[PDB]
């Protein structure tokens, strides 16, 4: 018959997270078969960046603690899994961190790079004191989903990385009108991420995954 | 008043009123790190 092809991208950015988008007026009945399909693609596989290995020049294993700091090595590595890192033209970089004195080590203390961008700068990593300091190297990579260290000289500390920028996806279906038909609906995605990827670029990336799985059909 | 807090030990400075002898007084608490239990579990203490 006749179908109205949705060709529009209306993104309402209120903050770095929770970006509400509205694709276009869909056909009658395509609000749920296309909205639930896009939700199962975003929450499943979206490229992200995560720290896969951290090397500290003072500690051997993640269980033994270091002097001068307050958080344990396990607590320090668990704080690295909440970093929002964005890579532009590289697939695997190597960051470093070195701070002394009685200062709260945050995500902004990492050495700046041209192809590395950190969204969260107030993320507390560790708390130091006048007794000692810490110095470590960070290695991030590109991935698609959850990959533990078991499925992936003695100072190498591997971490279970989760390459998923999306956190919560919800969709509602309302009524639309283009002065052409009577029964037309629009789709509104309440996409919420960690601020790494663009919400307008996530829809074009999710539409390509669905189209590639149907081209071979 | 707590003097210094470390991940492995906590040293406090005793107040001027709660001292038995005629000196300052310093209490040092060593925290138990990762040790083995009778049921092969982990036991460790974290400062608060």
Characterization of the model:
Chain B: It comes from Pseudomonas aeruginosa (strain ATCC 15692 / DSM 22644 / CIP 104116 / JCM 14847 / LMG 12228 / 1C / PRS 101 / PAO1). Chain B: The RNAP catalytic core consists of 2 alpha, 1 beta, 1 beta' and 1 omega subunit. When a sigma factor is associated with the core the holoenzyme is formed, which can initiate transcription. Chain B: DNA-dependent RNA polymerase catalyzes the transcription of DNA into RNA using the four ribonucleoside triphosphates as substrates. Chain B: Belongs to the RNA polymerase beta chain family. Chain B: This is DNA-directed RNA polymerase subunit beta. The structure is cut from a larger assembly and holds chains A (217 residues) and B (48 residues). Chain A is an alpha+beta fold and 217 residues long. Helices cover 15% and strands 35% of the residues of chain A. Chain A has 2 domains: 101 residues, no CATH class; 116 residues, no CATH class. In chain A, the strands form 5 sheets. In chain A, strands 1, 2, 13, 14 and 15 form a 5-stranded antiparallel β-sheet that branches. In chain A, strands 5-9-3-11 form a 4-stranded antiparallel β-sheet, with no helix packed on it. In chain A, strand 14 and strand 15 form a beta hairpin. The longest helix of chain A has 17 residues. The two termini of chain A are 22 Å apart. Chain B has 48 residues and is mainly β. Helices cover 0% and strands 38% of the residues of chain B. Chain B has no helices and 5 strands. Chain B has a 3-stranded antiparallel β-sheet with strand order 1-2-3, with no helix packed on it. In chain B, strands 4-5 form a two-stranded antiparallel ribbon. In chain B, a hairpin with a 5-residue loop joins strand 4 and strand 5. Chain B is elongated, with a radius of gyration of 15 Å. At the A-B interface, loops of A face loops of B.
């Amino acid at each position: 018959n006749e179908f109205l092809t949705p060709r529009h991208i209306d993104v309402q950015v209120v903050s770095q997270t929770r970006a509400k988008i509205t694709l276009e007026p869909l056909e009658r009945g395509f609000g749920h078969t296309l909205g639930n399909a896009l939700r199962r693609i975003l929450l499943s596989s979206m490229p992200g960046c995560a720290v896969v290995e951290a090397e500290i020049d003072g500690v051997l294993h993640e269980y033994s603690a270091i002097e001068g700091v307050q958080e344990d090595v396990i607590e320090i590595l668990l704080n690295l899994k909440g970093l929002a890192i964005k890579l532009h033209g590289r697939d695997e970089v190597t960051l470093t961190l070195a701070k002394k004195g009685s200062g709260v080590v945050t995500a902004a203390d990492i050495q700046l790079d041209h192809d590395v961008e950190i969204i969260n700068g107030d993320h507390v990593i560790a708390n130091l004191a006048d007794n000692g300091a810490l110095n470590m190297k960070l290695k991030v990579a590109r991935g698609r989903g959850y990959e533990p260290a078991d499925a992936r000289s003695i100072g190498r500390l591997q971490l279970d990385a989760s390459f998923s920028p999306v956190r919560r996806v919800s969709y509602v279906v309302e009524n639309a009108r283009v002065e052409q038909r009577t029964n037309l609906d629009k789709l509104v995605l309440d996409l919420e991420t960690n601020g790494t990827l663009d919400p307008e670029e996530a829809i074009r990336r999710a539409a390509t995954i669905l189209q590639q799985q149907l081209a071979a059909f | 008043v707590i003097d210094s807090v470390d991940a492995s030990r906590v040293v406090v400075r005793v107040a001027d009123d709660e001292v038995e002898t005629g000196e300052a007084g310093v209490d040092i608490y060593n925290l138990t790190k990762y040790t083995r239990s009778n049921q092969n579990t982990c036991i460790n203490q974290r400062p608060l």
